[PDB]
């Protein structure tokens, strides 16, 4: 059940006046692509303040990853889900190396060991964390660690399932898309096939549409390596498949995964959010 | 649980360019608002009918207005969900004079008989019809009589939660929006606040929502009877004012209710989908 919302003062939404004239802002399966002057976040941030929403937020830090932590957790301070409840949930092979971190109220950070080794976080997500996340949180964001949060991340992007739009691509044909393109794999699309390419760098959803896609992927993964064959981008051409096969009900722009060292920062992007550090 | 779509060949939706520019295609709480060109109908109607979607339609023809059902009725059969389950359920005080109607298959019609006499059709939805709705469809889908279908309404419609533009006041402003503007109503929204004005003619939704929406209207149209004060536009100033508080999760633009003798064909309607027959 969704109380009534307060009492607002905005500007109002001209039905003459589009948001952004310069990209599209919805794909064809009627879901929001969430671009920098589309949303307004006073809106948002009360519907999901008012369901007491608990945003869990995985990443792993395996060998010598753990030195990208302390970036990505002081940033994802400063600009991801400020206000409402996170829980971090940080896999690791070295406890020891996770850095004390200071939080904001109502967030915390849970540090899970996992054994020295794609596979393995498909795999942790739906496999072996499947109870304790139903339990926690409402929605989960999977990221990579080799980033760090330069803008607002928030509640714009939550909603069922949600891939983003690989920032190497998103003006790309299809055909040019670096799917998986062997019959002879799970992960196979063809070239007259494709809506967007996604990054496995960040996706999310409701925790039970990241474990249907999680281990969905994983699945796949597993009967490819029964038949000899590893997709051409592994983790990330499974989960394109698995998104051709079940649209996202949001896609995030570029604005969510950026490299701005390998693609500057072009007049299609307001703003850049969550970006890539070298490595 | 969604099953896997199946292969399809369509057009790659291409991001750097916008479906429609000459009107907002999105709320701002990342709500789509549904406009010609903005959805692939293919896609949709795989993904609803994978689920084997079940839509009831309600509409009420009370007195003089069981005249409109035999055009009402036959234009839906040619318009409405075609493909898709559908129940009609014709509210009448007339149930000899409700027209035999063909039907093609998967489709079916309900007469139920009302008391000779907006509260009613609100109370009638929530009240007396919740546990029929929730064991026969999935979406309820609430009209007016006097109305015709002249082209295609769809899956691309169905959502929680809907409302759709009033043809006469999308591009106004709010402060010429007639909500019901003394505060002693229920109903009341003052000149700052507002999104869209909604016309009380077309809504819908789960049964869920649609059972919440016309539940909350229908007590607080009894709260205002005992205060001794009935809203500007009745059922549709509450309405606005639900809609309002509880944001819907799509907006259907004008092409979904329009009155061609009133207003013409403007530029921005590539289609007439449900229209104003003279009364
Ligand atoms: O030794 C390692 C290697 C990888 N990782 C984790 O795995 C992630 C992915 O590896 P990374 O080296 O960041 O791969 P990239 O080349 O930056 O990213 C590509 O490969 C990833 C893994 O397949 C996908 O998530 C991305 O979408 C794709 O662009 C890292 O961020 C870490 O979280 C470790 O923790 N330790
Ligand atoms: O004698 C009547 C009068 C009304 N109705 C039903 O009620 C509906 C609404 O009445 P109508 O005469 O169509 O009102 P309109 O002036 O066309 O519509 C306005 O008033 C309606 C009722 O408040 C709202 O649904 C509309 O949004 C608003 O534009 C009709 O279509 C019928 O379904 C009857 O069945 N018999
Ligand atoms: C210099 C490297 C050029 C990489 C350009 C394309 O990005 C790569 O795309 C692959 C799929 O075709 C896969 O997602 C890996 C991805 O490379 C990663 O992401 C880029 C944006 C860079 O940050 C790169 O360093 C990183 O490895
Ligand atoms: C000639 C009548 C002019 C009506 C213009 C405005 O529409 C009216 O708007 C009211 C709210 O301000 C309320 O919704 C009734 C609505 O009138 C109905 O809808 C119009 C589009 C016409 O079809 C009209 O005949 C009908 O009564
Ligand atoms: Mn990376
Ligand atoms: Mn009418």
């Not at 060998?63 to 889900?81: D, R, W």
């Not at 760098?201 to 249907?212: D, M, T």
């Amino acid at each position: 059940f969704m109380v009534s919302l307060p009492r607002m003062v905005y500007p109002q939404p001209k039905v003459l006046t589009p948001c952004r004239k310069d990209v599209l802002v919805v794909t064809p399966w009627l879901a929001p692509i969430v671009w920098e002057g589309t949303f307004n976040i006073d809106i948002l941030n009360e519907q999901f303040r008012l369901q007491n929403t608990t945003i869990g937020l995985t990443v792993f830090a395996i060998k010598k990853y753990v030195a990208f932590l302390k970036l990505f957790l002081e940033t994802a301070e400063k600009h991801f889900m400020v206000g409402h409840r996170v829980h971090y949930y940080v896999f690791t092979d070295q406890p020891a190396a996770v850095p004390r971190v200071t939080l904001g109220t109502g967030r915390q950070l849970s540090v899970l060991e996992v054994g020295a080794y794609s596979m393995r976080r498909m795999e942790m997500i739906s496999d072996f964390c499947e109870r304790r996340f139903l339990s926690e949180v409402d929605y989960l964001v999977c990221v990579d660690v080799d980033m760090e949060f330069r803008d607002h991340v928030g509640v714009e992007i939550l909603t069922p399932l949600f891939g983003t739009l690989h920032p190497s691509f998103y003006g790309s044909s299809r055909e040019a898309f670096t799917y998986e393109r062997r019959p002879q794999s799970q992960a196979y699309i063809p070239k007259d096939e494709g809506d967007f390419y996604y990054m496995g760098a960040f996706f999310g959803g409701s925790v039970q549409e990241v474990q249907r896609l999680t281990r969905a992927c994983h699945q796949a993964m597993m009967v490819d390596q029964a038949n000899g064959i590893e997709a051409v981008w592994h983790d990330e051409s499974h989960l394109n498949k698995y998104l051709l096969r079940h649209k996202p009900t949001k896609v995030l722009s570029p604005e969510y995964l950026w490299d701005q060292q390998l693609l500057g920062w072009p007049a299609v992007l307001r703003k850049l959010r969550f970006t890539a550090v070298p490595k």
